Design a protein around this nucleic acid. Structure first.
Ligand code: MG
Ligand code: MG
Ligand code: ZN
Length: 354
DNA sequence: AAATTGCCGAAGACG
DNA sequence: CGTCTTCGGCAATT
């Protein structure tokens, strides 16, 4: 039964081919745009991220995430209150001085110009039906809508890339030492970290200058390298069901959010965060044998329900950042979601049948 | 040094 | 399950 659901969630190669062909052409064109000439964005480089490129996108290849990352030397980070995740960026005749607000590099000013450029470049595409969606306050995304003729969205995310050691709020995060190990953890933390122009919600409004840490590159590496054994899911090793559990949980949330508006505050990043914690708690590949898919999925569910009940789901890279805090999500919303998940769980998941 | 190239891993397709 | 295939990521090459 979960096996039947996975078969239906699995992406079709024909759909993948048709979608990738069009997405790649539009993205290449926009990136070449940025890269020329006089632009404050001239050195951007592309990094594909999120569930399609991690092979956990479900149902249809209809949403792609791509970062246009800019290396910015000598940046100084000031943590925004004690949030752990949010920062003001300042500096130690640069192109970026246009985006200054005092000595602070404004996320909003820089994103606005980035968006402005993308829109003008989209206007020049005559051979493909592509438009820029209305902007969402506080989001770091410039979202394209492509009609292929099927609808595909592409989120183009500006990012700052910094090569220094990671901010100290991350020092006790990424607790992979008994799963992926200390050499892996140390090596991942020697790679750059990223900031995206997603604004902190501060009371009734966004703080327009703030940026948020991103570990999309690390998350992508983890999904591609997720077993305690080096051969997990390789051609000379044993398949596990870790990614299948993540797909099933993302589907469950998606189906629930489609029918209940009260679940608007929940998102697939909560599910991904929860399963990173579960992969830490249950590190052995033998605990994710495909023969045991039903019980692995059940355990992930039990853990997610416990997060809800205790109002606690800490960011995997930034442990003091509680994604399920009362400030982010009302207690009533979590209680509403717990009720729905329990009903599905106790009734053999009728919602999987649509 | 911007653009092309091939290698091969992940995973869909199909028997 | 095996074998075949395409897409993506990498970096040397040029
Ligand atoms: Mg996505
Ligand atoms: Mg997205
Ligand atoms: Zn595996």
């Amino acid at each position: 039964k979960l096996k039947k659901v996975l078969d239906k969630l699995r992406l079709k190669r024909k759909d993948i081919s048709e979608a990738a062909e069009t997405v790649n052409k539009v993205v290449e064109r926009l990136l070449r745009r940025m890269q020329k000439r006089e632009s404050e964005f001239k050195g951007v480089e592309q990094l594909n991220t999120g569930s399609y490129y991690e092979h956990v996108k479900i149902s249809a290849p209809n949403e792609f995430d791509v970062m246009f990352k800019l290396e910015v030397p000598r940046i100084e980070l000031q943590e925004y209150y004690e949030t752990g995740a949010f920062y003001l960026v300042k500096f130690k005749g640069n192109p970026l001085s246009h985006f200054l607000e005092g000595e602070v590099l404004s996320a909003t000013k820089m994103l606005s110009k980035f968006r402005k450029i993308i829109k003008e470049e989209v206007k020049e595409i005559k051979d493909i039906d592509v438009s820029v969606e209305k902007e969402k306050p506080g989001s770091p995304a410039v979202t394209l809508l492509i009609r292929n003729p099927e609808e595909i969205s592409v989120d183009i995310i500006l990012a700052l890339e910094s090569k220094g050691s990671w901010p100290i709020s991350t020092k006790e995060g990424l607790p992979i030492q008994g799963w992926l190990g200390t050499k892996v953890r140390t090596n991942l933390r020697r790679e750059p970290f990223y900031l995206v122009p997603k604004n902190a919600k501060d009371g009734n409004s966004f703080q327009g200058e703030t940026w948020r840490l991103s570990f999309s590159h690390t998350e992508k590496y983890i999904l591609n390298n997720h077993g305690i054994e080096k051969t997990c899911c390789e051609s000379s090793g044993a398949k596990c069901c870790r990614k299948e559990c993540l797909k099933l949980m993302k589907y469950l949330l998606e189906q629930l959010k489609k029918e209940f508006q009260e679940l608007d505050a929940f998102c697939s990043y909560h599910v991904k965060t929860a399963i990173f914690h579960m992969w830490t708690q249950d590190p052995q590949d033998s605990q994710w044998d495909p023969r045991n898919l039903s019980s692995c999925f059940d355990k992930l569910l039990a853990f997610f329900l416990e997060c809800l009940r205790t109002e606690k789901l800490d960011h995997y890279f930034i442990p003091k950042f509680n994604l399920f805090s009362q400030e982010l999500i009302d207690r009533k919303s979590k209680e509403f979601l717990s009720k729905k998940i329990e009903y599905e769980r106790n009734n053999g998941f009728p919602i999987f049948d649509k």
